[PDB]
Each structure stands twice: as structure tokens, then as C-alpha cells.
Amino acid sequence: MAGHTDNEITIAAPMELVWNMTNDIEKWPGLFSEYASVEVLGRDDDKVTFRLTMHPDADGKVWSWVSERVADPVTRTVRAQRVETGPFQYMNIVWEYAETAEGTVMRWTQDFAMKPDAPVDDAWMTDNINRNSRTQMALIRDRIEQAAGERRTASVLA
Numbered sequence: 001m002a003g004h005t006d007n008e009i010t011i012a013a014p015m016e017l018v019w020n021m022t023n024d025i026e027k028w029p030g031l032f033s034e035y036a037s038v039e040v041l042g043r044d045d046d047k048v049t050f051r052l053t054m055h056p057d058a059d060g061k062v063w064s065w066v067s068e069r070v071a072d073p074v075t076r077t078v079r080a081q082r083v084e085t086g087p088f089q090y091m092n093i094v095w096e097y098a099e100t101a102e103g104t105v106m107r108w109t110q111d112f113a114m115k116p117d118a119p120v121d122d123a124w125m126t127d128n129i130n131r132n133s134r135t136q137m138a139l140i141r142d143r144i145e146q147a148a149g150e151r152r153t154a155s156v157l158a
């Protein structure tokens, strides 16, 4: 409670592949299904600034914003925040990964609060974020597992 989402998925693929594919942001439009577009606007050394544009929501509204993220492959963590807070007081996003017996776990956590005069409340935003997160996590899992299986078939059959 409240303005907090915490979602995870296990992907039956090795850490290197899961990390590389999920952090290849210019290819996000082909991996995720929720974005109309992803544009990388800048990179300092470590920090990547990019614009996301979602497909229309349930009200037909298009959400588009700029975020900055730092992905650190040594700790297998990513931290992101919104460059302009807009309707939010703030939005902080952390992605963590680990190895388990079943493959690579990826966990996505978001912590935020809406501004007093935002067009939607924390509950609406929380519900949307859980719904989209759960769907996208499931889809990314299927695509990466498919990529892993195809790589393995190629390797074993060669």
C-alpha cells in the first residue's frame, strides 16, 4: 500500500540472454506489445534517456513520457525514473534479476504517487501498471524462451 507494484516472472533461459534481450531498448517495440514506439533520446556514459509511447488506453488516451534509466550488469539491477513527473509526484522503477533452479527470475518494482490534481488516482494507476506488467512479463518470457530454444536447436543440430 499504496502506489506500489511488485511483479516477477521466471524465464527458462540463462541470465546473459534474459538481461541482454530485456535491456535492448531499441528492440522493445518488437519484444513488448504495449508500446507504439520507443525512442532513445540520449546516452551519457551510463544513463540512457528515452521516450516511451503506449498504445491507447481503455479511454483511448495515449500516454507518452521521457524516462532515464541506468542498467548495471554487474549487480543485474536497473533503476529508472521519469524525467518530467507530470501527473506523478514521482515514479521510481527498479528491475532486479537472479538465477534460480528454474531459470532467471526478473522482478519489476514501481513506486509512485499521483499529484493532487492528476486525472487519475493511485488505485487506477496501480491497476493499470499491474495489468500491463503481468501481460508484458508473460509475453517477454515466451519470446525469450523461444529465442533460447531456437538457439539451442541450432547449436545441438550443428
Ligand SMILES: Cc1cc2cc3c(O)c(O)cc(O)c3cc2c(=O)o1
Binding pocket: 057, 063, 065, 082, 091, 110, 128, 129, 130, 132, 133
Ligand atoms: C494507462 C497506463 C499508463 C501508464 C503510465 C506510466 C508512466 O507514465 C510511467 O512513467 C511509468 C509507467 O510504468 C507507466 C505505466 C502505465 C500503465 O501501465 O498504464
